Design an enzyme around this catalytic site. Sequence first.
Site, PDB file in Angstrom:
ATOM      1  N   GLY A 272      35.506  29.558  26.511  1.00 33.37           N
ATOM      2  CA  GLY A 272      34.582  28.816  25.629  1.00 33.37           C
ATOM      3  C   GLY A 272      33.374  28.256  26.369  1.00 33.37           C
ATOM      4  O   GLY A 272      32.494  27.655  25.726  1.00 33.37           O
TER       5      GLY A 272
ATOM      6  N   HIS B 131      27.033  38.985  24.466  1.00 34.43           N
ATOM      7  CA  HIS B 131      28.401  39.462  24.147  1.00 34.43           C
ATOM      8  C   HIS B 131      29.061  38.598  23.056  1.00 34.43           C
ATOM      9  O   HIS B 131      30.161  39.002  22.655  1.00 34.43           O
ATOM     10  CB  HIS B 131      29.252  39.683  25.407  1.00 34.43           C
TER      11      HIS B 131
ATOM     12  N   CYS C 225      31.153  29.950  28.069  1.00 35.95           N
ATOM     13  CA  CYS C 225      30.005  30.880  28.104  1.00 35.95           C
ATOM     14  C   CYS C 225      28.798  30.267  27.408  1.00 35.95           C
ATOM     15  O   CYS C 225      28.948  29.585  26.412  1.00 35.95           O
ATOM     16  CB  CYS C 225      30.364  32.215  27.512  1.00 35.95           C
TER      17      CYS C 225
HETATM   18  C1  LIG Z   1      32.718  33.696  27.356  1.00 33.22           C
HETATM   19  O1  LIG Z   1      32.066  34.581  26.490  1.00 33.22           O
HETATM   20  C2  LIG Z   1      33.215  32.617  26.444  1.00 33.22           C
HETATM   21  O2  LIG Z   1      33.271  31.465  26.810  1.00 33.22           O
HETATM   22  N1  LIG Z   1      33.562  33.077  25.215  1.00 33.22           N
HETATM   23  C3  LIG Z   1      33.989  32.222  24.150  1.00 33.22           C
HETATM   24  C4  LIG Z   1      35.512  32.094  24.173  1.00 33.22           C
HETATM   25  C5  LIG Z   1      34.832  32.817  23.008  1.00 33.22           C
HETATM   26  C6  LIG Z   1      33.878  34.390  28.036  1.00 33.22           C
HETATM   27  C7  LIG Z   1      34.669  33.373  28.860  1.00 33.22           C
HETATM   28  C8  LIG Z   1      35.833  33.956  29.628  1.00 33.22           C
HETATM   29  C9  LIG Z   1      36.468  32.918  30.540  1.00 33.22           C
HETATM   30  N2  LIG Z   1      33.370  35.517  28.825  1.00 33.22           N
HETATM   31  C10 LIG Z   1      33.810  36.746  28.562  1.00 33.22           C
HETATM   32  O3  LIG Z   1      34.528  37.037  27.605  1.00 33.22           O
HETATM   33  C11 LIG Z   1      33.493  37.865  29.474  1.00 33.22           C
HETATM   34  C12 LIG Z   1      32.855  39.006  28.694  1.00 33.22           C
HETATM   35  C13 LIG Z   1      31.579  39.545  29.312  1.00 33.22           C
HETATM   36  C14 LIG Z   1      32.002  40.654  30.255  1.00 33.22           C
HETATM   37  C15 LIG Z   1      33.308  41.209  29.718  1.00 33.22           C
HETATM   38  C16 LIG Z   1      33.858  40.167  28.728  1.00 33.22           C
HETATM   39  C17 LIG Z   1      35.170  39.545  29.145  1.00 33.22           C
HETATM   40  N3  LIG Z   1      34.761  38.411  29.989  1.00 33.22           N
HETATM   41  C18 LIG Z   1      35.326  37.889  31.081  1.00 33.22           C
HETATM   42  O4  LIG Z   1      34.844  36.930  31.676  1.00 33.22           O
HETATM   43  C19 LIG Z   1      36.632  38.495  31.580  1.00 33.22           C
HETATM   44  N4  LIG Z   1      36.521  39.024  32.916  1.00 33.22           N
HETATM   45  C20 LIG Z   1      36.703  40.310  33.100  1.00 33.22           C
HETATM   46  O5  LIG Z   1      36.956  41.079  32.178  1.00 33.22           O
HETATM   47  C21 LIG Z   1      36.510  40.852  34.496  1.00 33.22           C
HETATM   48  N5  LIG Z   1      37.067  42.180  34.502  1.00 33.22           N
HETATM   49  C22 LIG Z   1      37.649  42.756  35.543  1.00 33.22           C
HETATM   50  O6  LIG Z   1      37.661  42.281  36.681  1.00 33.22           O
HETATM   51  C23 LIG Z   1      38.372  44.043  35.213  1.00 33.22           C
HETATM   52  C24 LIG Z   1      39.313  44.554  36.115  1.00 33.22           C
HETATM   53  N6  LIG Z   1      39.948  45.699  35.805  1.00 33.22           N
HETATM   54  C25 LIG Z   1      39.681  46.318  34.656  1.00 33.22           C
HETATM   55  C26 LIG Z   1      38.763  45.807  33.726  1.00 33.22           C
HETATM   56  N7  LIG Z   1      38.117  44.657  34.018  1.00 33.22           N
HETATM   57  C27 LIG Z   1      35.016  40.842  34.817  1.00 33.22           C
HETATM   58  C28 LIG Z   1      34.226  41.651  33.807  1.00 33.22           C
HETATM   59  C29 LIG Z   1      32.722  41.737  34.176  1.00 33.22           C
HETATM   60  C30 LIG Z   1      32.481  42.210  35.593  1.00 33.22           C
HETATM   61  C31 LIG Z   1      33.252  41.344  36.523  1.00 33.22           C
HETATM   62  C32 LIG Z   1      34.740  41.415  36.220  1.00 33.22           C
HETATM   63  C33 LIG Z   1      37.819  37.553  31.518  1.00 33.22           C
HETATM   64  C34 LIG Z   1      39.121  38.326  31.796  1.00 33.22           C
HETATM   65  C35 LIG Z   1      37.898  37.010  30.064  1.00 33.22           C
HETATM   66  C36 LIG Z   1      37.698  36.430  32.547  1.00 33.22           C
END
Ligand SMILES: *[C@](O)(C(=O)NC1CC1)[C@H](CCC)NC(=O)[C@@H]1[C@H]2CCC[C@H]2CN1C(=O)[C@@H](NC(=O)[C@@H](NC(=O)c1cnccn1)C1CCCCC1)C(C)(C)C
Lengths: 305, 305
Positions: A143, A41, A145
């Site tokens: 960050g 991602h 990930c």
């Molecule tokens: C990671 O990639 C990172 O360190 N990135 C560096 C900063 C640039 C990053 C770290 C976040 C703390 N991870 C993500 O961005 C992941 C990716 C992979 C899957 C989707 C995206 C967003 N994300 C998240 O961890 C998010 N979590 C969610 O979006 C949850 N969603 C929901 O619960 C939900 C509820 N209602 C509607 C829509 N979504 C996750 C998504 C995957 C399944 C489990 C639930 C955040 C919000 C960033 C924590």
Amino acid sequence: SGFRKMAFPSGKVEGCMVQVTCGTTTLNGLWLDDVVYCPRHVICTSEDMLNPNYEDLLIRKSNHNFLVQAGNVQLRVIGHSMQNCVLKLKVDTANPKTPKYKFVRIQPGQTFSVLACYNGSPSGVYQCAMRPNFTIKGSFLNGSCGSVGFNIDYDCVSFCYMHHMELPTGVHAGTDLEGNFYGPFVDRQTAQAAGTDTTITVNVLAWLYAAVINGDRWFLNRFTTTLNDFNLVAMKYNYEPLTQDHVDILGPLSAQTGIAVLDMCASLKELLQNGMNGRTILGSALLEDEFTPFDVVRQCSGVTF
Amino acid sequence: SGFRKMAFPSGKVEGCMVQVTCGTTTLNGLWLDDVVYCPRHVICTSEDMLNPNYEDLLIRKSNHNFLVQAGNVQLRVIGHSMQNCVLKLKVDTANPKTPKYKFVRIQPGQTFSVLACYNGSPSGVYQCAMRPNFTIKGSFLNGSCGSVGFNIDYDCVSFCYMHHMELPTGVHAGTDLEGNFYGPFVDRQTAQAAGTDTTITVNVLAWLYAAVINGDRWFLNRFTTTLNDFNLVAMKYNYEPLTQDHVDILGPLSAQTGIAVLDMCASLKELLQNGMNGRTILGSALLEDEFTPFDVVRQCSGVTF
Ligand SMILES: *[C@](O)(C(=O)NC1CC1)[C@H](CCC)NC(=O)[C@@H]1[C@H]2CCC[C@H]2CN1C(=O)[C@@H](NC(=O)[C@@H](NC(=O)c1cnccn1)C1CCCCC1)C(C)(C)C
Ligand SMILES: *[C@](O)(C(=O)NC1CC1)[C@H](CCC)NC(=O)[C@@H]1[C@H]2CCC[C@H]2CN1C(=O)[C@@H](NC(=O)[C@@H](NC(=O)c1cnccn1)C1CCCCC1)C(C)(C)C
Ligand SMILES: [Cl-]
């Protein structure tokens, strides 16, 4: 004596950590030989995340879309491929600091050390368990990930986890190093239930044996139990069934302490039915389930790496 | 999000660990430049330990009485001196793997990472606090002596602890890297009371701010308190007095959460008076006191090394 949540020494993994940037997204990768492993991602925009077509998104990327950084040595990417939910960046330099290693998939209830990283730099190291529901209760900020989980056996780093995402409950999900998620999760921004977590019964018993090794034995009782009758009480308290294979893996601790596994089960049965009556075990007011039998043996026998 | 007992990445310290043998005694030393630091009781026999005259015992030792081993590179000792309760072995090779470093003395309530070692090889890494009574609740087996405690600030390892001994309560005592014991202890085999341990109040408050950062805020109340009236309740529960300097060091967490330190004190006052009523905070049924304000900031802001 004493008993601590102890991580593996992290040096070997520290020298494999790099920073991977694609567009606006910077996260961590694992640099082994001339390959950098990171969450796929990294290629996505905020809008792509609703239902990314990762095949199409990757096809539109070139090698020079990926900035890999080992401290300052700005690695040149010469190849990119996708395996399940992990990206592999072929680079022009093979990591000197590359330790001996395997990629393994752990089972629910097994433990590992997480090296939490930001920008390809270590923040800290901690232990945790793969929960029965295939989440982990980590400590991960934006960050983080691409931070990895690992065990060390002899001199060989077994990588078992790469961090991808946080659930709205504050628990964490990721993949093995072949890019297969632990649990039912998919790398898209949709509501995805983790499902019922349970207590890792074999691990609670391991930690009760730890407590006995450390002279904390108030909870030992004259009662005993069958495995079946134990499992009848444990299932009521959302404990994982205890299997004969679990009983077998507790054998070493049984032998060392001279307490039969089913006699320790009889101790846990009363703790569950009665609670601790404001007492503690190894400093804790709750039953601890993130030590494996091998963690207790490792720590109580001073195994080194 | 999430909050874990997180150690510093340990790689820098791993490359400084060596095995020191004198007579029948094998323990760990710290190899910085051409010097190996280890506990001075490496020179003692079981009978010497009742009241060793360390000056006389060391005078009877020669350089070749000390076998120093870096994995296999069998270091040749060219000098030996004593500083307080630590031995310094000058060797013919300066450690290449020598990181940047200082030697510091921590205060009661401060935290550090322990790299537990046997035979000059790392077993594992964990965090702990210097208790107000100058003991630590470690995990140390026979052969662990000379294992060190440390912090990392920028790229500089601050060594603060070297392990010497276990009290009959299962807690641990040692020295700073100038060989001065933490607390009243002397390196002889006599009964030595540690004295009253107390709860590290500033650290409990730090961990309550951690809980709020992580959305666990049930214990916040409308009440407030003066520092004096807080200290009247806290002293009854064997909590350390909270000083204005403690209130100042909680400022960052106060600012980040918008909860005044004395309002968090008012929250802790009710927790102490009422207990948790079978609730938990960050997974714990007890108030946790082994995170410093800086540990909470480090971990909740993703500071790296
Ligand atoms: C990671 O990639 C990172 O360190 N990135 C560096 C900063 C640039 C990053 C770290 C976040 C703390 N991870 C993500 O961005 C992941 C990716 C992979 C899957 C989707 C995206 C967003 N994300 C998240 O961890 C998010 N979590 C969610 O979006 C949850 N969603 C929901 O619960 C939900 C509820 N209602 C509607 C829509 N979504 C996750 C998504 C995957 C399944 C489990 C639930 C955040 C919000 C960033 C924590
Ligand atoms: C450490 O040197 C090591 O790893 N050695 C390698 C194996 C060869 C070793 C590790 C022990 C777990 N430490 C010690 O041997 C120290 C040294 C330094 C001080 C005395 C000796 C023995 N020792 C201990 O840690 C012991 N602890 C005690 O002797 C306690 N004694 C008493 O509480 C006591 C009570 N009644 C009468 C006499 N003594 C300590 C001694 C120091 C003050 C606090 C109480 C053992 C028993 C080995 C844990
Ligand atoms: Cl607890």
